[PDB]
Ligand binder design. Structure first.
Ligand SMILES: OC[C@@]1(O)OC[C@@H](O)[C@@H](O)[C@@H]1O
Ligand SMILES: OC[C@@]1(O)OC[C@@H](O)[C@@H](O)[C@@H]1O
Ligand SMILES: OC[C@@]1(O)OC[C@@H](O)[C@@H](O)[C@@H]1O
Lengths: 90, 90, 90
């Protein structure tokens, strides 16, 4: 029942995103330099990891959400969260 | 009872920090290019994530320590660990 | 029994590595811009974290694999995975 988190950051301000898996739901809190706020990410899962990279000033984020033995990748590329092509055999 | 870790690194040497949550306590091991040693970070929690960024040559670290459903952010900005402004409703 | 993941990425394409701890075994899935494939990393553990850094164009990866209270570091420096010098007292 205890929460599990993952975190990523970019830039120098910086921007931070913290993902929390709690009771089967993953949610997102965001910092862009002045106050924490709730992000758009809402996906099911009991376990989360994240990585991100910049292309110029454009951030790209990949969140790996797992339920049971099944991992789904979620992608932020500037215009909403979409399901990514990641697969694994678990 | 099994330990859970989080890791971050910066630079090219590199510097590495590995955080271990074990039996409700989070501790830190450090590498700055020649030998592992114990860091100053000691905070309670059963779950840990971390992110870091450089501003010039100055490292900034954020550790997200969770106990139950409560997440506390700890901040390294060059002069000791301090509690950060992160909040979430879990 | 549920899987736990860790992820790292580098570059702008980017390269991504996702490590999955499942039933005591850690495995690796890789993206280098066009298709996911299975990486060379295979090590025991119930918990995984990862960090990576570039020296020029050369990637270096450290995977922290934990079983029980024992953490082993695995190193990629361009020519196969090797056990690293990390130790901790847990
Ligand atoms: O500014 C917040 C936001 O747009 O940042 C990018 C992603 O983290 C989104 O989920 C999030 O809502
Ligand atoms: O050189 C070690 C150290 O000062 O590095 C910065 C932080 O990781 C501290 O907790 C740690 O003790
Ligand atoms: O191209 C894939 C690969 O060589 O990339 C570097 C490491 O992630 C290896 O485990 C992996 O097999």
């Amino acid at each position: 029942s205890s929460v599990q988190t993952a975190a990523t950051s970019w830039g120098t301000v910086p921007s931070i995103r913290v993902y929390t898996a709690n009771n089967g739901k993953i949610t997102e809190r965001c910092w862009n330099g002045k106050g924490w706020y709730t992000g758009a990410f809402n996906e099911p899962g009991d376990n989360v990891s994240v990585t991100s990279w910049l292309v110029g000033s454009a951030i790209h984020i990949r969140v790996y959400a797992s339920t049971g033995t099944t991992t789904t990748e979620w992608c932020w590329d500037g215009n909403g969260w979409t399901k990514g092509a990641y697969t694994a055999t678990n």
